[PDB]
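Researcher: Going back to the complex we discussed earlier. I've cleaned up the inputs and rechecked each line, so this should be the final set. Can you rerun the prediction on the complete assembly and write out the structure?
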Amino acid sequence: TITYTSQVANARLGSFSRLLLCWRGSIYKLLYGEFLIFLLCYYIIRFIYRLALTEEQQLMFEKLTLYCDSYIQLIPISFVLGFYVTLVVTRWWNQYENLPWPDRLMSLVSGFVEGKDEQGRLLRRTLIRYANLGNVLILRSVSTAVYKRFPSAQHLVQAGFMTPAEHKQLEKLSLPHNMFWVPWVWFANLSMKAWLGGRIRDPILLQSLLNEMNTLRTQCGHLYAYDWISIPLVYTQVVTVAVYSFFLTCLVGRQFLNPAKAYPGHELDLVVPVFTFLQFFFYVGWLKVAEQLINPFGEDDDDFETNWIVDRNLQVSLLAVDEMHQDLPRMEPDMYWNKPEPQPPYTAASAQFRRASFMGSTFNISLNKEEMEFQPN
Amino acid sequence: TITYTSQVANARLGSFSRLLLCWRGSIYKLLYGEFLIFLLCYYIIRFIYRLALTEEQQLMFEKLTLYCDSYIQLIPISFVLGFYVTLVVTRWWNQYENLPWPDRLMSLVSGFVEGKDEQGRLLRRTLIRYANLGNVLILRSVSTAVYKRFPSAQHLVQAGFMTPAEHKQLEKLSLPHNMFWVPWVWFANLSMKAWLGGRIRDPILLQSLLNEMNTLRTQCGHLYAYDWISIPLVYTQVVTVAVYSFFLTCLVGRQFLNPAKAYPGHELDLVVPVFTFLQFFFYVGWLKVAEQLINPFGEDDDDFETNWIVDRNLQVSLLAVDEMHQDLPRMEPDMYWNKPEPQPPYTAASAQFRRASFMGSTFNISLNKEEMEFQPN
Amino acid sequence: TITYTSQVANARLGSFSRLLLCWRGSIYKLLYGEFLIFLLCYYIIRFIYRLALTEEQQLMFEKLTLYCDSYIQLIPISFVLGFYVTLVVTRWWNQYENLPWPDRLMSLVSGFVEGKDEQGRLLRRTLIRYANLGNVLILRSVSTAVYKRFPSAQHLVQAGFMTPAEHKQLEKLSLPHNMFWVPWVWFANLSMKAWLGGRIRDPILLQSLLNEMNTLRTQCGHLYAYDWISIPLVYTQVVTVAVYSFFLTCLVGRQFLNPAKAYPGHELDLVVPVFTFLQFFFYVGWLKVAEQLINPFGEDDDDFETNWIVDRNLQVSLLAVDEMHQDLPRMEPDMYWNKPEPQPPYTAASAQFRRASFMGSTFNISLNKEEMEFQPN
Amino acid sequence: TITYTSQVANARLGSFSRLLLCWRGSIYKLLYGEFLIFLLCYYIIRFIYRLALTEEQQLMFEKLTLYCDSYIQLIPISFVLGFYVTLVVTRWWNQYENLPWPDRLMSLVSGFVEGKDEQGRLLRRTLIRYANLGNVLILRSVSTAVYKRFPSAQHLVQAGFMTPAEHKQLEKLSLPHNMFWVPWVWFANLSMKAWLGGRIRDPILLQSLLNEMNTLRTQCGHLYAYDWISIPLVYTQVVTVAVYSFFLTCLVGRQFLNPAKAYPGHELDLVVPVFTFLQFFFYVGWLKVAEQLINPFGEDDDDFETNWIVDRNLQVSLLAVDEMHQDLPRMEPDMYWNKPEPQPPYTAASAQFRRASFMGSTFNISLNKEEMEFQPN
Amino acid sequence: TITYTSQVANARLGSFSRLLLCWRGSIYKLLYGEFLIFLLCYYIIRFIYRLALTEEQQLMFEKLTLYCDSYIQLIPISFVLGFYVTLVVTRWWNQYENLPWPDRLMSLVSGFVEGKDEQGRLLRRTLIRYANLGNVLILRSVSTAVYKRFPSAQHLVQAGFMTPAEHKQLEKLSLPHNMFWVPWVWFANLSMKAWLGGRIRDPILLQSLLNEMNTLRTQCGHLYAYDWISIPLVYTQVVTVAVYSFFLTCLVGRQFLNPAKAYPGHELDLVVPVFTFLQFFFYVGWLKVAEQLINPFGEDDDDFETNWIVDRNLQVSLLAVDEMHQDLPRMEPDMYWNKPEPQPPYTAASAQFRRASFMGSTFNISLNKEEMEFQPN
Ligand SMILES: [Ca+2]
Ligand SMILES: [Ca+2]
Ligand SMILES: [Ca+2]
Ligand SMILES: [Ca+2]
Ligand SMILES: [Ca+2]
Ligand SMILES: [Cl-]
Ligand SMILES: [Cl-]
Ligand SMILES: [Cl-]
Ligand SMILES: [Cl-]
Ligand SMILES: [Cl-]
Ligand SMILES: [Cl-]
Ligand SMILES: [Cl-]
Ligand SMILES: [Cl-]
Ligand SMILES: [Cl-]
Ligand SMILES: [Cl-]
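Model: Rerun complete. Updated structure for the full complex:
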């Protein structure tokens, strides 16, 4: 994830232009190899046309260039790129929206599951560890960085996400499918055992716990779905064919012809086709947006920081269910205890953001007395 | 389903270009017959123009070609293809989103329904089998592969999805509609009987079970809706007419005219119209995206693997409600038992993904002392 | 509803081309009158230009045709058609998504409301009849076919959807608005009376019943909203003006001028403007998509089969709450009773769809021993 | 709201053409002033060019017209209009979707709150009046018609939406913000008092009541949000600048030049530029779609009928909670009491809509005996 | 936030034209620096071409200008701007939709948590203060104005959002991540303590409270997600490159060439390229829409008024849970006590908005007696 949110907080002078001086997650980093290949091919074709062809062959090449340049069209490539990249970006944000966060569940575990003794603490930690274990089980299946961190389930044992007993239990339950769903059944059965043991006082709290757990299950199932059901290969190949055919025909039709032949539109030899190169940067960077976002769980600069998410979820969940269980700050009267209209102060740097309330768009509508009286019937 | 998610994890050099060397679910596999027909028609017209027409007829054909080539427009076909294919892809992902997964329901069945004896085990298995039976009943109605697997309900009896008693009960309840909804009523009545029999301890657990069951019912009803209410035939015919008229007029207007006549734009005879063929690949592959995704439950390469889904759901549901009922791994203190900030290790292959936390975009905003003081009033 | 889902299960050779040989819900059925009017007007203008004008008048007509043909633009019509038809299709599928289905509610009524005697059976039937009566009350207000079936509420009395007592009660409660909401209040009060009478054992079941009832109420209210708040007339008129002005200027600018005058682009007289006719079919069929889907409750071929939905809902609801109440198939051990990994068989026609499981995209990532070891700290 | 849903029930011959003969909510009603201004400016410029310029000045004007006509582009205006109007229409339908309807809440109030005496009736009426008061408080803030109906809260007192006691209570609770949220807190506290007083028998009914109340609160908050956070002014100004610059350059570049000068494309003087006027109607009507829908709570023809909604909600809510509380029609056996497959009759006008059921798209798949047998293993 | 909703209530004569006379949040305010830079560069290039080049150099510059003007294309920039700005606007409204509002939660806190004594009042205030503290903790992380108001947590202590005890408790729980989630765990544990202490009478009320709290948690987590996961930098750079390359090539190709050379399209020297400047305003304002909305929590004119939201939420929440707890207006019979069809009056200014009810689109369908009779069978 490359974050530049602070750099674009305001629409200042050339705010998006300052983003062009970036390297991580940039157009250049994703495009330099393709651009160098295009450069080499274009200049090889140029040198062949200049110093490697006869006069008749050069005339034939000029006819070919004039024919190719008339078939270079911006409409199909722009249309398919816009629609395909919109689909890719929508799926990318949907994939982020299904990344599981155990915060609601950990709040309910810290609240509902009672007992400051060792058994209740162990129960809360085991429930939240089941949640985190299911999350990491799906993330090591969908994310290459998490898989590199945990190449096997024994790595999850060494990393504290799974106990040897849980590892053996998962080995007993081995079916020829992905077993990320097992910790959810473990969570349901353990919560049932907690409610039957008196640790959960009411079954409505059990229902809330299992509702949050099932929401996490749905998110992980959607992550598995996005990992499994790719965007159809035919669509990706259509977009790739469009872009690459466009620039293959630019590899010939955008060649600068001999200015001594007085060709229409080729009277000037600039050597470097800067407009073709700008089109290359724009179009192949538009393609690279999809090429980077199509699997947001890889190892690109703009890919999701899934290992950080796993670590943060584990730490925060364990702290919430273990150290923060019934550990409250002292409940004391606040600053606005007997002040019916609290007015928190503003700093000197924020005094300009003190704004009057918007009372609705109809507040300033002016009406005279005659038209404000209620008409009978 | 053709999965290439691992191949596009990173935006590497020509990552989408390596996808062009695929055959299953590719442009070529979906396009070779149409392209061969187009090739044959184009070259037959070419040979008729060359060696089967008089001089006046050839001049008339040249006039016709010049007239047809001026009416070849990229705007309508690209517009209608973009919007129609966007609709098709949206409906395709919606159809996947309504494929039923019994994991939440099977967790609730494994937890709520009590009893390690034969009767409670039979009750849990029968409930989860009702869920899977309803799912397979709608899937054999919407999917051609599932229907080929189960041409009749007696095949479902031989496959263990339905007992002979359930088959006879469904035969008694025969109405002149699709009877996929029956197992949901069976599930509701059986869960009510379980709650009245003491197997379900509280009616809130019954409510949760029936909520998950009704969610599965809504998903199956949406699958039936997508199978019944197709995209309107007029829209599909509009897109088909656009594409096929475009290439019917390319069948004549893209013919290479006689270079001895010195026609503008036809001074070169390349024999093979590679740009027309690239346009054909692009546009008819864009059409084939819709032609493949319009019914994602058929037997295409990119169609859903519904038989695998049915088998996996049956196996996982039966294992969850039967073998995993109150079968928990030993609850033991974890690795981070008394470690308030757990730090799971990273492998050498994943040490570069250890990242500092993003504390918000306002964290690096610099303010001096004077503008940080709270102003009075 | 015209269903061709089985015909487009696979992306076969010309699968969308075979849909062009259809008549119901086709382009031709929705377009033949407009196309005949366009044909007659075009050929009348042609005959006026040929055999009804002087030489100077013919020259003036040729100038007018050359001026009109330069203002025939594809961009505005395609843009507005794409966006407007996308809006129409989205609203059409939203209107289908709000068609009420009582299956969840009927499952909850069959389960929760107890009593195999006459009173409990009457109670269940009356509740589900209130649901179906509200559905049919909104559908006879939004659908022309349902209104033709039930022109008055007395027709609903003769059709069994309403009793004479309910008809008199609705006549007492007559307000100058649509009274489709009344059966929902009836359902709520009857369910409260059932819970107070002991027929509903717990108020949580009452809450579930009323939640499903309120979901049906929201769907019917959305149907009323879509019937009331049309797409704004200005937008529809904008699209209509665009299309009809395009073809009014094609009625003159696409006329074949005299070939003896040697006009650029008019050197050939084809008599029949096949490309203008293909554009007419495409564009006015794109318009007809919106013209058919804008009110999906009318009597078009692709309009919703609302009368069938009403009949199916009534039959299925009455069967579910009356005959299927606590009427369960015998609960017996299944085929996979002691088989921990069930494997249902495949037919010879479906053996090719037996697929291995997708274990995640990271499953085939290769790592050596050195980079798989956990690094310290 | 202009409703033409009945006029577009079928895709008949020129169904959208018959909508062009409308005046309320039409293109002409929203466009006549702008079109007359454009007409006057165009003909003033025409008369200046004809009878108010010297020969050299006329030649300079002709050069200016030829220069302006080459910069008249349809692409930017169509793109920005399509995207902006799509945003406006989406926000308009979202604003309708957040218009509060108290029907679910009034059903729950009529059911849950018990007592046919004066106190329970007063309690139900006060709860539903709190709901309607909150709705009208937000609607008089977002809608100009509702504000004209109730310029002050004392008008709400005279209109029965608020009692003098509630008006005084709201005056006591005066904060410098919009106080539409107060009746929701009133509803919550009154429902709590009702449950503690025995009028609400179970707290689950209290939860359902407050859930419906909070849904209404969310809808009203979204209405306030749409009233407050407008579409950004820069986007609206971009679209306005595009359209108005397009027609300002059409005001000169679309002038008919002198035909005696033999200008290319200006050899004919039609006086009235009908194609420029059609473009004006189309584009400025596309703009007027956004200009009318951007605030759907104003006083346009297609704006929401908010006063009718308020009146209908008040009447229906009071009738539902007061007269329909435990007032049920007599529960009697229906027409299909012992008829397991009910078949309601069809009228002669609706007999053609009797359709066979769609049993799924796989129902007609033909398989022979050999390929239907289950293969072993 | 710049609100002009009242100015666009009606589609009046030039309603969007009157918005062009605005300065705050306008095109000019966001564009004047870029436009002045473009103006200076264009006129510097103009003066170099006029008074700083030789005749051969001027001819070369004319060739360069003719070459650059043929590569100025509107299609890619318009496509990428439309799609990118649509994405930005969608994300901007999603970010507003996840701004937390404690109104539902404060209603439930005012209702459920009992006790008019000091302890219950302190409990309600502490719960609602936990909600507001979590909201302000995420808003000071995502919003620059809120961070300027509260540069540190000690500023939150001085502003009454946090007590010194809560500040010390948060300092004890310090993990190397953002600690905005802590008040949600505090809320859950405090609500559990309230229910165990008898302040919350039933656990269903506890479930409702924690459901509203978890909804607020999800909204704040989505705000954190939008702050962290920016739109990918490659897409922003693609759009920026497109726009800036378009206007860099307009900086040369739109120069007015020497009219004495008689160049096609350059026969007139207008000095000021008003059409290029209109294109600049339109396109760079379209870009500025995204440049302003990409981070809606900055300090732009159209950015969200987050400090006002924080203050309003604090005041309204404290008033609702403290002063409005069981403080109800006197429950008295209303104006329509025994009036079954209430008719609130209309003012003279609103009498035209009194409209008859829409009874459905099928209400005016005419049928004769013969076709209204039910057909047998
Ligand atoms: Ca990636
Ligand atoms: Ca298919
Ligand atoms: Ca219709
Ligand atoms: Ca309006
Ligand atoms: Ca901003
Ligand atoms: Cl799921
Ligand atoms: Cl170039
Ligand atoms: Cl459903
Ligand atoms: Cl070609
Ligand atoms: Cl509703
Ligand atoms: Cl034609
Ligand atoms: Cl809300
Ligand atoms: Cl014109
Ligand atoms: Cl969340
Ligand atoms: Cl210019």
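Model: Worth noting: The pocket of calcium ion (ligand 5) is lined by residues A 9-11; E 292, 295-296, 298, 300, 303 (CB under 6 Å).
Researcher: Good, that matches what I expected from the previous run.
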